[PDB]
Design a protein around this ligand. Structure first.
Ligand SMILES: *[C@@H]1O[C@H](CO)[C@@H](O[C@@H]2O[C@H](CO)[C@@H](O)[C@H](O)[C@H]2NC(C)=O)[C@H](O)[C@H]1NC(C)=O
Ligand SMILES: *[C@@H]1O[C@H](CO)[C@@H](O)[C@H](O)[C@H]1NC(C)=O
Ligand SMILES: *[C@@H]1O[C@H](CO)[C@@H](O)[C@H](O)[C@H]1NC(C)=O
Lengths: 112, 49
């Protein structure tokens, strides 16, 4: 039901803004300059574009010299309420040359 | 005049940062609200090639 993120400065998306969307079959990534919605939608004009509970998914995001790096890990878990007590290390997914300023972000979820 | 250079105000680029219009990043002290006179319009030009 959780599926992605929006990042940027203004988040109007006339201003450039990273979008990341999982759609179960793929991960889809864009930097768009099209005016986005007031409130995000996932009902059941971009300079760059790309395409690839009992469980926990972890992601680390950082933006350095216009490279947006992503690291991740997936695991089973037995407490839903709190972050797990044990130790694990995330591994690099991607290292994206998007070239954009980022100070604000939001998350995307599927809707009835 | 199809070849352009962008600005001359406050904030300046990180390495491989790209910069684009959406609001008038104006050319002096005062807000402009679409004015192009004193302090105003983007500090954006073209080369006389
Ligand atoms: C990256 O975006 C931030 C806004 O989120 C810009 O920071 C602001 O810049 C103005 C001047 O242009 C300052 O008056 C504000 O105080 C700044 N705000 C913050 C939160 O720092 C930043 O300038 C942008 N980067 C570049 C290089 O333009
Ligand atoms: C996911 O997005 C790609 C294009 O980015 C599309 O080909 C694919 O059919 C989409 N899948 C779903 C389930 O929407
Ligand atoms: C659409 O994106 C291009 C660059 O990808 C940009 O030149 C253009 O100004 C954008 N259009 C809008 C409506 O911002």
């Amino acid at each position: 039901i959780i599926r992605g993120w929006i990042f940027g400065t203004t988040l109007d998306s006339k201003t450039q803004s990273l979008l990341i969307v999982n759609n179960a079959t793929n991960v889809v990534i864009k930097v768009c300059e099209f005016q986005f919605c007031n409130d995000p939608f996932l009902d059941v004009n971009c300079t760059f574009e790309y395409v690839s509970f009992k469980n926990l998914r972890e992601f680390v995001f950082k933006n350095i010299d216009g490279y947006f790096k992503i690291y991740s890990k997936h695991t089973p878990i037995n407490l839903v309420r709190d972050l797990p007590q044990g130790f694990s290390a995330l591994e690099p997914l991607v290292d994206l040359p998007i070239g954009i300023n980022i100070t604000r972000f939001q998350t995307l979820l599927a809707l009835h | 005049y199809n070849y352009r250079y962008r600005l001359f105000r406050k904030s300046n680029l990180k390495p491989f940062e790209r910069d684009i219009s959406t609001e008038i990043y104006q050319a002096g002290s005062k807000p402009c609200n679409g004015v192009e006179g004193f302090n105003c319009y983007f500090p954006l030009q073209s080369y006389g090639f």
